[PDB]
UniProtKB/Swiss-Prot annotation, chains A, B:
Role this protein plays: Catalyzes the oxidative deamination of primary amines to the corresponding aldehydes with the concomitant production of hydrogen peroxide and ammonia. Has a preference for the primary monoamines methylamine and benzylamine. Could also act on 2-phenylethylamine but much less efficiently. At endothelial cells surface can also function as a cell adhesion protein that participates in lymphocyte extravasation and recirculation by mediating the binding of lymphocytes to peripheral lymph node vascular endothelial cells in an L-selectin-independent fashion.
Main subcellular localisation: membrane
Location of 2',4',5'-topaquinone modifications: Y414
InterPro entries documented for this protein: Cu_Am_Ox_Cu-bd, Cu_Am_ox_TPQ-bd, Cu_amine_oxidase, Cu_amine_oxidase_C, Cu_amine_oxidase_C_sf, Cu_amine_oxidase_N-reg, Cu_amine_oxidase_N2, Cu_amine_oxidase_N3
Active site positions, chain numbering: D329 (proton acceptor), Y414 (schiff-base intermediate with substrate)
Extracellular face residues: 1-671
Compartment annotation: Cell membrane
Protein name: Amine oxidase [copper-containing] 3
GO cellular component terms listed in the entry, alphabetical order: cell surface; cytoplasm; early endosome; endoplasmic reticulum; Golgi apparatus; membrane; microvillus; plasma membrane
Family membership: Belongs to the copper/topaquinone oxidase family.
Amino acid sequence: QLFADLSREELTAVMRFLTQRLGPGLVDAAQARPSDNCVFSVELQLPPKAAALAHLDRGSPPPAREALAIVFFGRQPQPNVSELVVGPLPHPSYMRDVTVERHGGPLPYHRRPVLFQEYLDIDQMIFNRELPQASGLLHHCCFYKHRGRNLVTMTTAPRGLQSGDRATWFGLYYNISGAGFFLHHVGLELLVNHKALDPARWTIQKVFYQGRYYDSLAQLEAQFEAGLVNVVLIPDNGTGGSWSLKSPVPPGPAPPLQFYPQGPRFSVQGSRVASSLWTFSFGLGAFSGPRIFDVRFQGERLVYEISLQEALAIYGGNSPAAMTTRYVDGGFGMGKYTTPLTRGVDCPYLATYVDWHFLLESQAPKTIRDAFCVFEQNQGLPLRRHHSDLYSHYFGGLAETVLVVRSMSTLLNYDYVWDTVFHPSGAIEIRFYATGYISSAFLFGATGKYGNQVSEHTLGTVHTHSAHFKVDLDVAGLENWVWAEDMVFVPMAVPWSPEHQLQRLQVTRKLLEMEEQAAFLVGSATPRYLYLASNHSNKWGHPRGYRIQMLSFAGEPLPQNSSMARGFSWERYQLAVTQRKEEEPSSSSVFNQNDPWAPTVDFSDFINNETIAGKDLVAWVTAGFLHIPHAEDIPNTVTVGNGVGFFLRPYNFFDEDPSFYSADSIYFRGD
Amino acid sequence: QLFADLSREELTAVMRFLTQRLGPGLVDAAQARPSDNCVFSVELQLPPKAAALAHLDRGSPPPAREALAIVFFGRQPQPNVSELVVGPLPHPSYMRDVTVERHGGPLPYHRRPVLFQEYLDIDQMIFNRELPQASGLLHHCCFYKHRGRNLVTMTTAPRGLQSGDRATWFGLYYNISGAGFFLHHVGLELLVNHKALDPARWTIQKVFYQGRYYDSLAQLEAQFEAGLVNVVLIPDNGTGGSWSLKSPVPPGPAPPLQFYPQGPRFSVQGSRVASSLWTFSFGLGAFSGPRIFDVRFQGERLVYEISLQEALAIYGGNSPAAMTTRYVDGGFGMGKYTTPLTRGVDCPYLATYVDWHFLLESQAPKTIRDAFCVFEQNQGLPLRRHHSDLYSHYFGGLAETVLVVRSMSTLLNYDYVWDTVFHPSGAIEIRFYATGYISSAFLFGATGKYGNQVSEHTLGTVHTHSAHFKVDLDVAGLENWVWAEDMVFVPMAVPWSPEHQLQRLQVTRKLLEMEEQAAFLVGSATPRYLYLASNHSNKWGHPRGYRIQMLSFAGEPLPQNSSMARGFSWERYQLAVTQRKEEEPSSSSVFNQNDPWAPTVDFSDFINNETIAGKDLVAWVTAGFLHIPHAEDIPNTVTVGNGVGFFLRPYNFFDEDPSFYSADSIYFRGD
Ligand SMILES: *[C@H]1O[C@H](CO[C@H]2O[C@@H](C)[C@@H](O)[C@@H](O)[C@@H]2O)[C@@H](O[C@@H]2O[C@H](CO)[C@@H](O[C@@H]3O[C@H](CO)[C@@H](O)[C@H](O[C@H]4O[C@H](CO)[C@@H](O)[C@H](O)[C@@H]4O)[C@@H]3O)[C@H](O)[C@H]2NC(C)=O)[C@H](O)[C@H]1NC(C)=O
Ligand SMILES: *[C@@H]1O[C@H](CO)[C@@H](O[C@@H]2O[C@H](CO)[C@@H](O[C@@H]3O[C@H](CO)[C@@H](O)[C@H](O)[C@@H]3O)[C@H](O)[C@H]2NC(C)=O)[C@H](O)[C@H]1NC(C)=O
Ligand SMILES: *[C@@H]1O[C@H](CO)[C@@H](O[C@@H]2O[C@H](CO)[C@@H](O)[C@H](O)[C@H]2NC(C)=O)[C@H](O)[C@H]1NC(C)=O
Ligand SMILES: *[C@@H]1O[C@H](CO[C@H]2O[C@@H](C)[C@@H](O)[C@@H](O)[C@@H]2O)[C@@H](O)[C@H](O)[C@H]1NC(C)=O
Ligand SMILES: *[C@@H]1O[C@H](CO)[C@@H](O)[C@H](O)[C@H]1NC(C)=O
Ligand SMILES: *[C@@H]1O[C@H](CO)[C@@H](O)[C@H](O)[C@H]1NC(C)=O
Ligand SMILES: *[C@@H]1O[C@H](CO)[C@@H](O)[C@H](O)[C@H]1NC(C)=O
Ligand SMILES: *[C@@H]1O[C@H](CO)[C@@H](O)[C@H](O)[C@H]1NC(C)=O
Ligand SMILES: *[C@@H]1O[C@H](CO)[C@@H](O)[C@H](O)[C@H]1NC(C)=O
Ligand SMILES: [Ca+2]
Ligand SMILES: [Ca+2]
Ligand SMILES: [Ca+2]
Ligand SMILES: [Ca+2]
Ligand SMILES: [Cl-]
Ligand SMILES: [Cl-]
Ligand SMILES: [Cu+2]
Ligand SMILES: [Cu+2]
Ligand SMILES: [Cu+2]
Ligand SMILES: [Cu+2]
Ligand SMILES: [Cu+2]
Ligand SMILES: [Cu+2]
Ligand SMILES: [Cu+2]
Ligand SMILES: [Cu+2]
Ligand SMILES: [Cu+2]
Ligand SMILES: [Cu+2]
Ligand SMILES: [Cu+2]
Ligand SMILES: [Cu+2]
Ligand SMILES: [Cu+2]
Ligand SMILES: [Cu+2]
Ligand SMILES: [Cu+2]
């Protein structure tokens, strides 16, 4: 496996190599401060596609196993963060900054994501130096006690208002046991200015309490005991979903159970899963998230790569937090926040479960058990089917059984469900669901344009979800073209009665040659049939292609007049196809999160006058939808209807529905 | 069971009663001749909602169990086809001609569907009068031995060009045995003007053979014998999916499958199903198709009824038949063409199968085994789910299990799979797929405007699929309103830093008061969050409602300039909402198919400027798509991602996610 995420051991060797080259002033990033030199991350560095392919096809010698490590360099006059490529594994030797090379110049230190350590200091400063200045108020409303931390904080992004900032707003919640605190915002949000390399110089720029702005906790505290701050008492406990996840009702009859009568018909051999029809390797980007490479259907490779690129979530709000939150989850990392899968709930009780080794903000490799799960799910629905009683009685059909590869990313409040379905029809399905806990704020004022009240004093904040996927199809090879077929009604006379009129239905086919005419903004209509296809024809003389069908209800992307709108330019499209370049492996950056104003990676820069006619193309799909919270989002948001994504379906790629050749396919005559 | 379909006894009772009060001139519609009198169909006349609800949930006396019977009166000077509502079953007493009452006016005979007899009468005219006149041509091109009729014809629709017609176009295909004959067009189509009441009077107005139009079979045979008809010999046999339906590859490791560990959590008695969560009555309209009534989630009725209302398939092509086919399949009968379900393919093995009785084109009611299938399906995906590793390490999930009611209709070539899935969240999903075989034509000329080549000498005719559903919700009462909520970005300077700009995300909440406001034309933007609500609010003061999330890519509906458009005016809408009037019980009629030029039930008329505020409403959803046949549709077209419909989701209808109380919910802490 050329695409097997770095191994438990491999990570160890890269780290041992680094401790040695980066000098000893290097500290474990698990407890480093702005001024320390620490290794933020180390994971698989993807091999170039050319060499990658040569190895898989000619048999040529595979490229070198490299790893990308991000190191924060605070131990220096002009601190920076840099991308260094290490290798070749398993026994490293070289190492080389690529930062400037990849991003034109030095990566500004303020863009670096917030370290685990860095968060504590913020609570440190909050629960210790700050919150006390308003204990009076707190002793009242929120049961603050002379003991501490019966409350917790929650970050938001981006940090600030213009490029170069690191000012984060933190809501305060009740530290609820065994259930989401997200639903119990105490009403207080603080704008922490944590830009200084010295935690001693961090400050509170502004405070927002139950409706109004205060310059400091003190001033607020002051006004509270002064008698001018009316407080709405927030209960610290209760019953129902708003309070617990444990269902009050005792079990009944066991829910239908899925099982393989003769055992699993697939085989996860490391990162590569192999079944009767499909074969592929899988993984998880520490930041990008789930990814699959070299997808071969019955031997033939359709896709070189289908990877998650980014996740956005723009909030509308009542308070300052909600109001400015525009999370760019990859800034946190979908791989990193991948929660272990619960056998029986997250995946069928008899699914295969795989582990995930990572080296992020730490110096020794850790593992997430059951990060992924691969299994076969009998849909209950038939793939194909036809009952004939006319002229010749017979029946032929096939009940559909699919192959799923799942993984879940729990970024703070909600959990993402990354589903990759492999159909017997040679069709590939990609879906993602947003479930778990929604982000709520304190309810005050007319609940009109920011959400609905889902529970007392708690407001479901409106927001949009949007994910981006890289779909590096290599339909029947590397050089593919984009075709756009649709329909139309041509009025014309009836050949056998020119006295009458008919609306002749015809197909409308167009070739997309320029990246632009193949980039479709969110909102505008798209061709009913859109697909990338080969230069070569399938038996009946048609270019063998694979169609791209989407399932998006995507909200409107932040207006362009927004200076951060560039931090996630991909959201403005439903789809775009470009010349898959080696210098365009990602559509977003982990750095884009903390500084969307000055994108480390701007996706719109992938679309320029270029021919997407006979080149190595890559499609970019954006799926998403508007989420106006409501009662039934308590406790968790369900997955029903909320699962968006897209399809990769063959169109004249095969000379016939291969499922014809299904072992499991059924046939008989009459009854 | 006041919604339950009529059974043998009842149908018999009505028939017995009909042949009695109808008198002497009443032949068995099975053989009945054009100028005969016969009972075309005896079905259940749906009860007036008012009294239905009056009794159902109060105690009032149940309404008169009725049955609507349709008779073709041909044996008379002024032939009409009439709708008669028969007396109180089980022992019928009265009879009323509702034709004028109901449709207002008399039903022109030429609107009557073509009886299974007329079809025979036709084949006789073809084979035993016309086909021999081209014995020479056929004996060559088509292995045509006048012996055994190795060819079969296939009706199209509508019949005629202007209203008042009955001139069908029949293509001729090989009588393949045990497979689809649709993939084998012999290039010969015919225009049988079976308008007259006397079968001898019928004639072929035009003939079409492998490209050219001719005036008579004789004229063709003549030119063939003359030498001016270069025939392309269509192979009558061969292998692959185009000939077989039975997979060649033997059975391999068995596919996974479910099973209820402690038996099924749902019971089926008659037409009513009930589980811990759901309660409802199902059934099947003869032409209307699948329908469901009195849906109660834990006792609360959400919908009075949700039924299919019509199906349509508008075609394009180079061949006359194809070139003008606009199937309003309800003119055929989705109930009527419901084929038997194959246990383990069409539905899981461990499902509950149901029969269906009917008195159609016969004098004796017959039954269809396993017409319906009800079961429970562990989806193998989670409903709600959160894994906590931040602050408090708890986990709460619930893999989703759904309840399904299915039925499959086989209208000649394709089989429609009708779904309706009730989810543990109180969301009702309606999906329908199109599978089975396509409709092919003879290949020739510049191919590209009408379809792709899917096999030797056969084209995959471009077409559109659409289906209309009557969703008559009753959100906690009959008075429901229509809300259209949706986003918008409002720029305003950053409260705490005016120098900086901000894009304030907000929600728009507009109320639809007129039917015109609520009717949404296909291809036009619709409010993201659109739903019907009650007057009454939930514990958090928001209106109690259900939103209608749509799932369709409806291809452009037939223009309006076209003479027939009105026959299926609903196809021009994605959604529309109206006042549940008892006289607007259906969006289409069985009689519309043969007279699209003079619709028996014009749907555009259901949309007049009436207030849809605080009334009993009903939504009309339209879901469909464009189908451009491709190789992978051979042997059959697969369901994968071709299932369109919609969801009925609870929106502030509950005080929370009702699944929090799932007995099957899961919770715990740590691993
Ligand atoms: C689809 O196309 C590929 C590649 O064809 C490419 O052709 C070039 C010119 C670009 O337009 C690119 O966009 C196309 O994809 C097919 O495989 C190759 O097909 C090309 C023809 O298009 C073959 O190239 C020719 O090769 C001969 C000698 O082998 C050359 O002499 C030709 O060029 C001469 O003339 C021009 C103009 O005077 C000069 O500029 C040149 O210097 C030469 O003097 C020409 O390039 C090529 O041989 C094919 N591949 C091989 C080596 O087997 C592919 O088969 C096709 N698929 C189908 C079925 O449609
Ligand atoms: C981000 O900061 C790192 C700091 O590690 C920068 O890399 C450093 O680059 C300097 C300049 O080449 C290296 O300095 C050394 O200076 C001595 C003094 O004579 C010379 O003899 C050595 O040959 C060497 O050049 C330093 O070793 C190197 N450190 C590492 C581990 O990379 C880096 O340039 C900054 N990134 C960007 C994008 O500017
Ligand atoms: C269709 O024909 C029927 C024939 O039964 C007409 O109704 C009957 O008409 C006869 C005399 O023609 C009366 O004696 C019966 O009492 C009528 N009852 C029935 C059976 O309907 C009917 O008027 C005609 N309707 C249309 C469509 O014009
Ligand atoms: C909700 O409406 C009920 C019936 O609607 C009519 O009755 C009055 C509200 C009147 O204003 C008409 O215009 C309405 O269309 C009504 O009887 C209930 O009292 C109403 N309940 C609530 C919660 O307002
Ligand atoms: C939150 O409280 C729980 C117990 O209620 C404790 O285990 C956890 O460490 C606390 N964390 C914070 C942020 O106070
Ligand atoms: C919340 O209330 C319940 C019942 O009223 C009580 O049992 C529980 O201890 C409370 N929550 C906690 C753990 O403090
Ligand atoms: C695209 O590039 C061409 C040059 O090849 C130029 O003529 C044209 O104006 C450009 N169109 C755009 C995207 O403005
Ligand atoms: C087709 O062949 C079957 C085989 O038994 C025969 O019963 C049927 O009559 C034939 N249909 C035709 C050509 O009408
Ligand atoms: C087609 O040929 C096969 C021999 O391979 C034969 O079994 C079959 O009967 C022929 N077609 C039919 C069913 O008439
Ligand atoms: Ca480009
Ligand atoms: Ca490619
Ligand atoms: Ca109306
Ligand atoms: Ca209603
Ligand atoms: Cl037309
Ligand atoms: Cl903004
Ligand atoms: Cu290898
Ligand atoms: Cu900086
Ligand atoms: Cu309160
Ligand atoms: Cu491992
Ligand atoms: Cu049958
Ligand atoms: Cu980078
Ligand atoms: Cu959400
Ligand atoms: Cu929702
Ligand atoms: Cu009753
Ligand atoms: Cu007439
Ligand atoms: Cu029965
Ligand atoms: Cu855990
Ligand atoms: Cu009618
Ligand atoms: Cu179709
Ligand atoms: Cu298709």
